[PDB]
Amino acid sequence: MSRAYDLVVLGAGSGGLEAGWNAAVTHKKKVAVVDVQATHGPPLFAALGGTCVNVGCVPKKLMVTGAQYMDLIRESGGFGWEMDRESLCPNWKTLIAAKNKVVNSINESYKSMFADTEGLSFHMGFGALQDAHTVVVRKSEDPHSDVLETLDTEYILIATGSWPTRLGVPGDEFCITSNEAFYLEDAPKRMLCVGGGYIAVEFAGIFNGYKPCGGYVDLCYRGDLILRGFDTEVRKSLTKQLGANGIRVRTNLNPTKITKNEDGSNHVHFNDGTEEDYDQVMLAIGRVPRSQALQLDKAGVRTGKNGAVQVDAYSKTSVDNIYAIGDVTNRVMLTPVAINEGAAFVETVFGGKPRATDHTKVACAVFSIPPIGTCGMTEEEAAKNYETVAVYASSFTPLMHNISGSKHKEFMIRIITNESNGEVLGVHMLGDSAPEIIQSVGICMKMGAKISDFHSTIGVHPTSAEELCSMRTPAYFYESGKRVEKLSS
Amino acid sequence: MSRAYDLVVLGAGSGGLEAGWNAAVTHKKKVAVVDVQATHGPPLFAALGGTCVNVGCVPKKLMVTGAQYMDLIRESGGFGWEMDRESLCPNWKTLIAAKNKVVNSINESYKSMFADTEGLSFHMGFGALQDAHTVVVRKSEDPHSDVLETLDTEYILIATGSWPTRLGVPGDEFCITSNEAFYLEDAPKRMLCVGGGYIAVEFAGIFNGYKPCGGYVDLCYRGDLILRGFDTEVRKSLTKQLGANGIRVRTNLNPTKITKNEDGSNHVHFNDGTEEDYDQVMLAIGRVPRSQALQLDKAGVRTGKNGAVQVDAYSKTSVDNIYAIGDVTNRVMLTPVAINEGAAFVETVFGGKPRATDHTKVACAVFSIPPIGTCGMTEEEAAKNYETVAVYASSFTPLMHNISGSKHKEFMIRIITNESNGEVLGVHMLGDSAPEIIQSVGICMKMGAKISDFHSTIGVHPTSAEELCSMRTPAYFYESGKRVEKLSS
Ligand SMILES: Cc1cc2nc3c(=O)[nH]c(=O)nc-3n(C[C@H](O)[C@H](O)[C@H](O)COP(=O)(O)OP(=O)(O)OC[C@H]3O[C@@H](n4cnc5c(N)ncnc54)[C@H](O)[C@@H]3O)c2cc1C
Ligand SMILES: Cc1cc2nc3c(=O)[nH]c(=O)nc-3n(C[C@H](O)[C@H](O)[C@H](O)COP(=O)(O)OP(=O)(O)OC[C@H]3O[C@@H](n4cnc5c(N)ncnc54)[C@H](O)[C@@H]3O)c2cc1C
């Protein structure tokens, strides 16, 4: 060797740590991993473990699980479970305490991971580039901060992920994002969620569960229908189900300005001219790659749309020895995707066995209440790219909801196929257990499954998933881009 | 035509109705369907819809769902849900009421199905054979009952299903089975479940949820480990988890005699010499095909082991125009299996397109708490039939159970493969959502999936199912029948 490190990883995230660990253990390389802090929390939020562990998937799901009990406690009544329901609210503070305990516990398991792994070291601070071989770790994000260390490396991996966009509106700084929501002292009584992304929807569901008495949550979106890019029938059925669960969904609406009332709350002026008071206002309107403070110009790494680091199918940047993975590349912003990209990177460069990450037919979930499980193409997209498209659809209400009272809780399955050969192009599910079911669906679609593979499989009874195997007749069709009730040419 | 009916179906069960409906609607045949009664209930229990609808899968799952709330209510505490927990018991009577409402609601939808379907008619009473073309519907099971009608038919389908075996022991008639359990006036305080089948386990879980104060349930099995035929590690981990949830599991034990105490309860003498009092004693020790009262001798249909109607891969009996499907054939006693066998029968005989039911790689579930999801071969079996077998194993505790308190709730996945080519021979799961996940696993295994298909699929995070895709290193091996740690050649 002529260099201090083989790899310097900028960001100890989902992708960062995965790569760093692999190079260190499986290929015995000298890896240095740079992240902002060691444990979760403000004012930096993200930490060792990345967004997912600290202010993402992990804490968000624990809170969804918590909020889910609201429905579950109500539903037990029909089964004979008698208890004082009127004026029953959960303790937000014990939830946040429970959550912090867990997240911090994961943070600490990482410290002793670094301590035990040889060749792997953690370097706390803000990283930035000097040249293709030099990463400077500064005291703060400010480019004139004290240089804490200078890392002389062979390879540089950028895995700094993304960051919430703001509204750019008079009184914008009075709002919170997903970051601050995780650390709220008290559960808001009058909550407003701006946005129509999965984050906006999942959080609306959390606050809806943890609101105090007389509390309510409004979901405000500037478009026609929430969750763009999802199955249209799924989006409409969820909007309907959020309504039934107490979330007031507002459409074609946008905050114009926010002014802070002298009692603490926030006065919000709207698109249509209306005015309302909210105890808290959360912005979930977009997440841009975190690359602006990396001095990428100095090393000459090309950043396209919104600062996204431009990469080929092997994550290589404009500079031959610099790489980038995960949310910073602005592809599919999911944890297991970043993990996969990081795994491929190591296999390619240090394993000598190149591999590109497969970005198509990736299954994902929305942890709304009820949850979404999706994998593949929406009918609208499939119809543009294929000659003949068959749409299968089935809605049903599980029998338990006759007893539970939650008659609004329809399970929905929609299968999208290429009619030519029967190949399944998309699977879209709404209802409980949807995230769990879709995972094994994604294995099938990876194997290039056909609709005949589904209905030939003997079902498991009684389950919600068994309805995948009972869809033979298509609901309708798409003949070269247009919706037809019947098929003939 | 020369005959009154094309098809007479003996039993309006899962398989019976499926066949009957198909012949009638898709092939416009004259179908007569014979079942004992129109709606569920004692003293006949089974009715229009079969065991599954009336005294099986459907009612059993509603009750499991009910009992599941016990854990869910306890678990909400950690998330901030405060309520009076000490001395909290569910109302068994409102559960049974809720159940009855649902089951009888399904019964009623069948009446109007018959009313609207042309060529399909229901004939209430006990059926029996006269010859290859004549089915007599009697007033009762007694062969000297009044003949209600004589059905002159082309084809006869036997789909009368199965019936619980008894203990054959002094005081046996003081015990109940699954049938009577569904109609108990009150939830027993001191409950005993005899057996180690899925039924025994699922019901133990139901009574454990609906027991009053100071109540308890004992599970008594005559063998070493409950649930023979299941993954050994799964069986042990469930035994451990039933224990942790309050069910006292007893092994190598058997009632010797039962005598009724004059206060109502039951005194039970055991195999080891012990004596105990139980408010109710349920036998779940086997289900034999219901064929003894069919006068099969008359028509000359061969009945092998325990009265099972002997059939080839197309369900054809010893008589060329008589057929039999479902539990009466004593193959795989599952609802969707019987449904499939019935569907195949119609396609073969009336559709002119023969098909045999695929009995291998059928996925099933056990709705215990926590539930089992299984599809394929156990390692013990796979090791006997294959050259080289690789065993993959992964246990983990979902993070939510740090908060919930249920630290005993490990999720377990065990994948069994043929090492030669990587083909997945078995998948065995323990934990919540296991029945739902396994369904889409069964599609994969039908397509002949390999272990490489699993870990190449990008995961859905955070879920329990995502752990299927993270099992690369085998735990150990089987080299031509024997357990080896690593593999030598
Ligand atoms: C509210 C929310 C919910 C989500 N839910 C899900 C979900 O359910 N499922 C799912 O798959 N994904 C989910 N995600 C997305 C997921 O968190 C990200 O896609 C994933 O973490 C991306 O991995 P990464 O390694 O690219 O970035 P990250 O995991 O975010 O890692 C980036 C790390 O780099 C550090 N960093 C930033 N700048 C510097 C610097 N200059 N120097 C050193 N270190 C730096 C940060 O501190 C951070 O820890 C969610 C995200 C959010 C915000
Ligand atoms: C407690 C319990 C739980 C179960 N849980 C599940 C589960 O979770 N999943 C699953 O897949 N399976 C489950 N099963 C098994 C499932 O119910 C059976 O395998 C299935 O119903 C068999 O279908 P079949 O058509 O062969 O018989 P059935 O559906 O039982 O139909 C038989 C019908 O024939 C009628 N009959 C009987 N004798 C005569 C006669 N001589 N003349 C006219 N009619 C007659 C009966 O009234 C009955 O309605 C469960 C069973 C039980 C007992």
Coordinates of N, CA and C in Angstrom, one line a residue, chain A residues 152-329:
Chain A
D152 N -6.4 10.3 3.5 CA -5.7 10.0 2.2 C -6.2 8.6 1.8
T153 N -7.0 8.6 0.7 CA -7.7 7.3 0.3 C -7.6 7.0 -1.2
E154 N -7.7 5.7 -1.4 CA -7.8 5.2 -2.8 C -9.1 5.4 -3.5
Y155 N -10.2 5.1 -2.8 CA -11.5 5.2 -3.3 C -12.4 6.1 -2.4
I156 N -13.3 6.9 -3.0 CA -14.3 7.7 -2.2 C -15.7 7.2 -2.6
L157 N -16.5 6.9 -1.6 CA -17.9 6.6 -1.8 C -18.8 7.6 -1.2
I158 N -19.6 8.3 -2.0 CA -20.6 9.3 -1.5 C -21.9 8.6 -1.2
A159 N -22.3 8.6 0.1 CA -23.6 8.0 0.5 C -24.2 8.9 1.6
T160 N -24.2 10.2 1.3 CA -24.7 11.2 2.3 C -26.3 11.3 2.2
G161 N -26.9 10.6 1.4 CA -28.4 10.5 1.3 C -29.1 11.9 1.0
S162 N -30.3 12.1 1.5 CA -31.1 13.2 1.2 C -31.5 14.1 2.4
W163 N -32.3 15.1 2.1 CA -32.7 16.1 3.1 C -34.0 16.8 2.7
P164 N -35.0 17.0 3.6 CA -36.3 17.6 3.3 C -36.2 19.0 2.7
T165 N -37.0 19.2 1.6 CA -37.2 20.5 0.9 C -38.1 21.3 1.7
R166 N -38.0 22.6 1.7 CA -38.9 23.5 2.4 C -39.9 24.2 1.4
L167 N -40.8 24.9 2.0 CA -41.9 25.5 1.2 C -41.6 26.8 0.5
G168 N -40.6 27.5 1.0 CA -40.2 28.8 0.5 C -41.3 29.8 0.5
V169 N -41.8 30.0 1.7 CA -43.1 30.8 1.8 C -43.0 31.7 3.1
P170 N -43.4 32.9 3.1 CA -43.5 33.7 4.3 C -44.0 32.9 5.5
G171 N -43.1 32.7 6.5 CA -43.4 32.0 7.7 C -43.1 30.5 7.6
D172 N -42.3 30.1 6.6 CA -41.8 28.8 6.4 C -41.1 28.2 7.5
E173 N -40.2 29.0 8.2 CA -39.4 28.6 9.3 C -40.2 28.2 10.6
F174 N -41.5 28.5 10.6 CA -42.4 28.2 11.7 C -42.9 26.7 11.6
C175 N -42.5 26.1 10.4 CA -43.0 24.7 10.2 C -41.9 23.7 10.6
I176 N -42.4 22.4 10.8 CA -41.5 21.3 11.0 C -41.5 20.4 9.8
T177 N -40.5 19.5 9.8 CA -40.4 18.4 8.8 C -40.5 17.0 9.6
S178 N -40.2 16.0 8.9 CA -40.2 14.6 9.5 C -39.1 14.6 10.6
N179 N -38.0 15.2 10.4 CA -36.9 15.3 11.4 C -37.4 15.7 12.8
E180 N -38.0 16.9 12.8 CA -38.5 17.5 14.1 C -39.7 16.8 14.7
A181 N -40.5 16.2 13.8 CA -41.7 15.5 14.2 C -41.4 14.3 15.2
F182 N -40.2 13.7 15.0 CA -39.7 12.6 15.8 C -39.4 13.0 17.2
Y183 N -39.3 14.3 17.4 CA -38.8 14.8 18.7 C -39.7 15.8 19.4
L184 N -41.0 15.9 18.9 CA -42.0 16.8 19.5 C -42.3 16.4 20.9
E185 N -42.3 17.4 21.8 CA -42.5 17.3 23.2 C -43.9 16.7 23.5
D186 N -44.9 17.2 22.8 CA -46.3 16.8 23.0 C -46.9 16.5 21.6
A187 N -47.9 15.6 21.6 CA -48.7 15.3 20.5 C -49.7 16.4 20.2
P188 N -49.6 17.1 19.0 CA -50.4 18.2 18.6 C -51.9 17.9 18.7
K189 N -52.6 18.9 19.1 CA -54.1 18.8 19.1 C -54.7 19.1 17.7
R190 N -54.2 20.2 17.0 CA -54.6 20.6 15.7 C -53.4 20.5 14.8
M191 N -53.3 19.4 14.0 CA -52.2 19.1 13.2 C -52.4 19.3 11.7
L192 N -51.5 19.9 11.0 CA -51.6 20.0 9.6 C -50.4 19.3 8.9
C193 N -50.7 18.4 8.0 CA -49.6 17.8 7.1 C -49.8 18.3 5.7
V194 N -48.7 18.9 5.2 CA -48.6 19.4 3.9 C -47.9 18.3 3.0
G195 N -48.5 18.0 1.9 CA -47.8 17.0 1.0 C -48.8 15.8 0.6
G196 N -48.3 15.0 -0.3 CA -49.1 13.9 -0.7 C -48.2 12.7 -1.0
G197 N -47.0 12.7 -0.5 CA -46.1 11.6 -0.6 C -46.3 10.6 0.5
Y198 N -45.6 9.4 0.5 CA -45.8 8.4 1.5 C -45.5 8.9 2.9
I199 N -44.5 9.8 3.0 CA -44.2 10.3 4.3 C -45.3 11.2 4.9
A200 N -45.9 12.0 4.0 CA -47.0 12.8 4.4 C -48.2 12.0 5.0
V201 N -48.5 10.9 4.2 CA -49.6 10.0 4.5 C -49.3 9.2 5.8
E202 N -48.1 8.7 5.9 CA -47.8 7.8 7.1 C -47.8 8.6 8.4
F203 N -47.4 9.9 8.3 CA -47.4 10.7 9.5 C -48.7 11.2 9.9
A204 N -49.5 11.6 8.9 CA -50.9 11.9 9.2 C -51.6 10.8 10.0
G205 N -51.3 9.6 9.6 CA -51.8 8.4 10.3 C -51.3 8.3 11.7
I206 N -50.0 8.7 12.0 CA -49.4 8.7 13.3 C -50.1 9.7 14.2
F207 N -50.2 10.9 13.8 CA -50.8 12.0 14.6 C -52.3 11.7 14.8
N208 N -53.0 11.2 13.8 CA -54.3 10.7 14.0 C -54.5 9.7 15.1
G209 N -53.5 9.0 15.4 CA -53.5 7.9 16.4 C -53.2 8.5 17.8
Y210 N -52.3 9.5 17.8 CA -51.8 10.1 19.1 C -52.3 11.5 19.4
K211 N -53.3 12.0 18.6 CA -53.9 13.2 19.0 C -54.7 13.1 20.3
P212 N -54.7 14.2 21.1 CA -55.5 14.3 22.3 C -56.9 14.5 22.0
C213 N -57.8 14.6 23.0 CA -59.2 14.8 22.8 C -59.5 16.0 22.0
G214 N -60.6 15.9 21.2 CA -61.0 17.0 20.3 C -59.9 17.3 19.2
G215 N -58.8 16.6 19.3 CA -57.8 16.7 18.3 C -58.2 16.3 16.9
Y216 N -57.5 16.8 15.9 CA -57.8 16.4 14.5 C -56.5 16.7 13.6
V217 N -56.4 16.0 12.5 CA -55.3 16.2 11.6 C -55.9 16.4 10.2
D218 N -55.4 17.4 9.5 CA -55.7 17.8 8.1 C -54.5 17.4 7.2
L219 N -54.8 16.8 6.1 CA -53.8 16.5 5.1 C -54.1 17.4 3.9
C220 N -53.1 18.3 3.7 CA -53.2 19.3 2.6 C -52.3 19.0 1.4
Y221 N -52.9 18.8 0.3 CA -52.1 18.5 -0.9 C -52.5 19.4 -2.1
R222 N -51.5 19.8 -2.9 CA -51.7 20.8 -4.0 C -52.2 20.2 -5.3
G223 N -52.2 18.8 -5.3 CA -52.7 18.1 -6.5 C -54.1 17.5 -6.3
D224 N -54.6 16.8 -7.4 CA -55.9 16.2 -7.3 C -56.1 15.0 -6.4
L225 N -55.1 14.2 -6.5 CA -55.1 12.9 -5.8 C -53.8 12.6 -5.1
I226 N -53.8 12.2 -3.8 CA -52.6 11.9 -3.1 C -51.8 10.7 -3.6
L227 N -50.5 10.6 -3.4 CA -49.7 9.5 -3.7 C -49.5 9.3 -5.3
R228 N -49.0 10.3 -5.9 CA -48.7 10.3 -7.4 C -47.7 9.1 -7.6
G229 N -48.0 8.4 -8.7 CA -47.1 7.2 -9.1 C -47.6 5.9 -8.6
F230 N -48.7 5.9 -7.8 CA -49.4 4.7 -7.3 C -50.6 4.4 -8.1
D231 N -51.1 3.2 -7.9 CA -52.3 2.7 -8.6 C -53.5 3.7 -8.2
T232 N -54.1 4.2 -9.3 CA -55.2 5.2 -9.1 C -56.3 4.7 -8.2
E233 N -56.8 3.5 -8.4 CA -57.8 2.9 -7.6 C -57.4 2.7 -6.1
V234 N -56.1 2.4 -5.9 CA -55.6 2.3 -4.6 C -55.5 3.6 -3.9
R235 N -55.1 4.7 -4.6 CA -55.0 6.0 -4.1 C -56.4 6.6 -3.6
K236 N -57.4 6.3 -4.5 CA -58.7 6.8 -4.2 C -59.4 6.0 -3.0
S237 N -59.1 4.7 -2.9 CA -59.6 3.9 -1.8 C -59.0 4.2 -0.5
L238 N -57.7 4.6 -0.5 CA -57.0 5.0 0.7 C -57.5 6.4 1.2
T239 N -57.7 7.3 0.2 CA -58.2 8.6 0.5 C -59.5 8.5 1.2
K240 N -60.3 7.6 0.7 CA -61.6 7.3 1.3 C -61.5 6.7 2.7
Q241 N -60.5 5.8 2.9 CA -60.3 5.1 4.2 C -59.6 6.0 5.2
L242 N -58.8 6.9 4.8 CA -58.2 7.9 5.7 C -59.3 8.8 6.2
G243 N -60.2 9.2 5.4 CA -61.4 10.0 5.7 C -62.2 9.3 6.8
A244 N -62.6 8.0 6.5 CA -63.3 7.2 7.5 C -62.7 7.1 8.8
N245 N -61.3 7.2 8.9 CA -60.6 7.0 10.1 C -60.3 8.4 10.8
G246 N -60.9 9.4 10.2 CA -60.8 10.8 10.9 C -59.9 11.8 10.3
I247 N -59.1 11.4 9.3 CA -58.2 12.3 8.7 C -58.9 13.1 7.6
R248 N -59.0 14.4 7.7 CA -59.6 15.3 6.7 C -58.6 15.6 5.6
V249 N -58.8 15.0 4.4 CA -58.0 15.1 3.3 C -58.4 16.3 2.4
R250 N -57.5 17.3 2.2 CA -57.8 18.5 1.4 C -56.9 18.5 0.1
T251 N -57.5 18.9 -1.0 CA -57.0 18.7 -2.3 C -56.9 20.0 -3.0
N252 N -55.9 20.2 -3.9 CA -55.7 21.5 -4.6 C -55.6 22.6 -3.7
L253 N -54.8 22.5 -2.6 CA -54.7 23.4 -1.6 C -53.2 23.6 -1.2
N254 N -52.9 24.8 -0.8 CA -51.5 25.1 -0.5 C -51.4 26.3 0.5
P255 N -50.6 26.1 1.5 CA -50.3 27.3 2.4 C -49.7 28.5 1.6
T256 N -50.2 29.7 1.9 CA -49.6 30.9 1.3 C -48.7 31.6 2.2
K257 N -49.0 31.7 3.5 CA -48.1 32.2 4.5 C -48.5 31.7 5.9
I258 N -47.6 31.7 6.8 CA -47.8 31.3 8.2 C -47.3 32.3 9.2
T259 N -48.1 32.7 10.1 CA -47.8 33.7 11.1 C -48.0 33.1 12.5
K260 N -47.1 33.3 13.4 CA -47.1 32.6 14.7 C -48.0 33.4 15.7
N261 N -49.1 32.8 16.1 CA -50.0 33.4 17.2 C -49.2 33.5 18.5
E262 N -49.5 34.5 19.3 CA -48.8 34.8 20.5 C -49.0 33.9 21.6
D263 N -49.9 32.9 21.4 CA -50.1 31.8 22.4 C -49.3 30.6 22.1
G264 N -48.6 30.5 20.9 CA -47.8 29.4 20.5 C -48.1 28.8 19.2
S265 N -49.4 28.7 19.0 CA -50.0 28.0 17.8 C -49.6 28.8 16.5
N266 N -50.0 28.2 15.3 CA -49.7 28.8 14.0 C -50.9 29.1 13.2
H267 N -51.0 30.4 12.7 CA -52.0 30.8 11.8 C -51.6 30.6 10.4
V268 N -52.4 29.8 9.7 CA -52.1 29.4 8.3 C -53.1 30.0 7.3
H269 N -52.6 30.7 6.3 CA -53.4 31.2 5.2 C -53.2 30.3 4.0
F270 N -54.4 29.9 3.4 CA -54.4 28.9 2.4 C -54.6 29.5 0.9
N271 N -54.4 28.6 0.0 CA -54.5 28.8 -1.4 C -55.9 29.4 -1.8
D272 N -57.0 28.9 -1.3 CA -58.3 29.3 -1.6 C -58.8 30.5 -0.8
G273 N -57.9 31.0 0.1 CA -58.2 32.2 0.8 C -58.6 32.0 2.3
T274 N -58.8 30.7 2.6 CA -59.2 30.3 4.0 C -58.0 30.5 5.0
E275 N -58.4 30.6 6.3 CA -57.4 30.8 7.4 C -57.8 29.8 8.5
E276 N -56.8 29.2 9.1 CA -57.0 28.2 10.2 C -55.8 28.2 11.1
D277 N -56.1 27.8 12.4 CA -55.1 27.7 13.4 C -54.6 26.2 13.6
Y278 N -53.3 26.0 13.6 CA -52.8 24.7 13.8 C -51.7 24.7 14.9
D279 N -51.7 23.8 15.8 CA -50.7 23.7 16.9 C -49.4 23.3 16.3
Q280 N -49.4 22.6 15.2 CA -48.1 22.2 14.5 C -48.4 22.0 13.0
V281 N -47.4 22.4 12.1 CA -47.5 22.3 10.7 C -46.3 21.6 10.1
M282 N -46.5 20.4 9.6 CA -45.4 19.6 9.0 C -45.4 19.6 7.5
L283 N -44.2 19.8 7.0 CA -43.9 19.8 5.5 C -43.3 18.5 5.1
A284 N -44.0 17.8 4.2 CA -43.5 16.6 3.6 C -43.7 16.7 2.1
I285 N -42.9 17.6 1.5 CA -43.2 18.0 0.1 C -42.0 17.7 -0.8
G286 N -41.0 17.0 -0.3 CA -39.9 16.5 -1.2 C -38.6 16.4 -0.4
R287 N -37.7 15.5 -0.9 CA -36.4 15.2 -0.3 C -35.3 15.3 -1.4
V288 N -34.5 16.3 -1.3 CA -33.4 16.5 -2.3 C -32.1 15.9 -1.8
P289 N -31.3 15.4 -2.7 CA -30.0 14.8 -2.4 C -29.1 15.8 -1.6
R290 N -28.4 15.3 -0.6 CA -27.6 16.1 0.3 C -26.1 16.2 -0.3
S291 N -25.9 17.1 -1.2 CA -24.6 17.2 -1.9 C -24.1 18.6 -2.0
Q292 N -24.9 19.6 -1.7 CA -24.6 21.0 -1.8 C -23.4 21.4 -0.9
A293 N -23.1 20.7 0.2 CA -22.1 21.1 1.1 C -20.8 20.1 1.1
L294 N -20.7 19.4 0.0 CA -19.6 18.4 -0.2 C -18.4 18.9 -1.0
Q295 N -18.4 20.1 -1.4 CA -17.4 20.6 -2.3 C -17.1 19.7 -3.5
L296 N -18.2 19.3 -4.2 CA -18.0 18.4 -5.3 C -17.4 19.0 -6.5
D297 N -17.6 20.3 -6.6 CA -16.9 21.2 -7.6 C -15.4 21.0 -7.6
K298 N -14.8 21.1 -6.4 CA -13.4 20.9 -6.2 C -12.8 19.6 -6.8
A299 N -13.5 18.5 -6.5 CA -13.0 17.2 -7.1 C -13.6 17.0 -8.5
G300 N -14.5 17.8 -8.9 CA -15.1 17.8 -10.3 C -16.0 16.6 -10.5
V301 N -17.0 16.5 -9.6 CA -18.1 15.4 -9.7 C -19.4 16.1 -10.2
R302 N -19.9 15.6 -11.4 CA -21.0 16.2 -12.0 C -22.4 16.0 -11.3
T303 N -23.1 17.1 -11.0 CA -24.3 17.0 -10.3 C -25.5 17.6 -11.2
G304 N -26.4 16.7 -11.6 CA -27.5 17.1 -12.5 C -28.6 17.7 -11.7
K305 N -29.8 17.1 -11.8 CA -31.0 17.6 -11.3 C -31.1 17.6 -9.7
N306 N -31.2 18.8 -9.2 CA -31.3 19.1 -7.7 C -30.1 18.6 -6.9
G307 N -28.9 18.6 -7.5 CA -27.7 18.2 -6.9 C -27.4 16.7 -6.9
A308 N -28.2 15.9 -7.6 CA -28.0 14.5 -7.7 C -26.7 14.1 -8.3
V309 N -25.9 13.3 -7.7 CA -24.6 12.8 -8.3 C -24.9 11.8 -9.4
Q310 N -24.4 12.2 -10.6 CA -24.7 11.4 -11.8 C -23.8 10.2 -11.8
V311 N -24.4 9.0 -12.1 CA -23.7 7.7 -12.0 C -24.2 6.8 -13.1
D312 N -23.3 5.9 -13.5 CA -23.6 4.8 -14.4 C -24.2 3.6 -13.6
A313 N -24.6 2.6 -14.3 CA -25.2 1.4 -13.8 C -24.3 0.7 -12.7
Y314 N -23.1 1.2 -12.5 CA -22.2 0.6 -11.5 C -21.8 1.7 -10.4
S315 N -22.6 2.8 -10.4 CA -22.5 3.8 -9.4 C -21.2 4.7 -9.5
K316 N -20.5 4.5 -10.6 CA -19.3 5.3 -10.9 C -19.7 6.7 -11.3
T317 N -18.9 7.7 -10.7 CA -19.2 9.1 -11.0 C -18.4 9.6 -12.2
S318 N -18.4 10.9 -12.5 CA -17.6 11.5 -13.5 C -16.1 11.4 -13.2
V319 N -15.7 11.2 -12.0 CA -14.3 10.8 -11.6 C -14.2 9.3 -11.4
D320 N -13.2 8.7 -12.0 CA -13.1 7.3 -12.1 C -13.0 6.5 -10.8
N321 N -12.5 7.1 -9.8 CA -12.3 6.4 -8.5 C -13.3 6.8 -7.4
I322 N -14.1 7.8 -7.7 CA -15.2 8.2 -6.9 C -16.5 7.6 -7.2
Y323 N -17.3 7.1 -6.2 CA -18.6 6.5 -6.4 C -19.7 7.1 -5.6
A324 N -20.9 6.9 -5.9 CA -22.1 7.4 -5.2 C -23.3 6.4 -5.2
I325 N -23.9 6.2 -4.0 CA -25.0 5.3 -3.9 C -26.2 5.9 -3.1
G326 N -27.3 5.4 -3.2 CA -28.5 5.8 -2.4 C -29.1 7.1 -2.7
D327 N -29.8 7.7 -1.8 CA -30.6 8.9 -2.0 C -29.9 10.1 -2.7
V328 N -28.6 10.1 -2.5 CA -27.8 11.2 -3.1 C -27.7 11.1 -4.7
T329 N -27.9 9.9 -5.2 CA -28.0 9.7 -6.7 C -29.4 10.0 -7.2

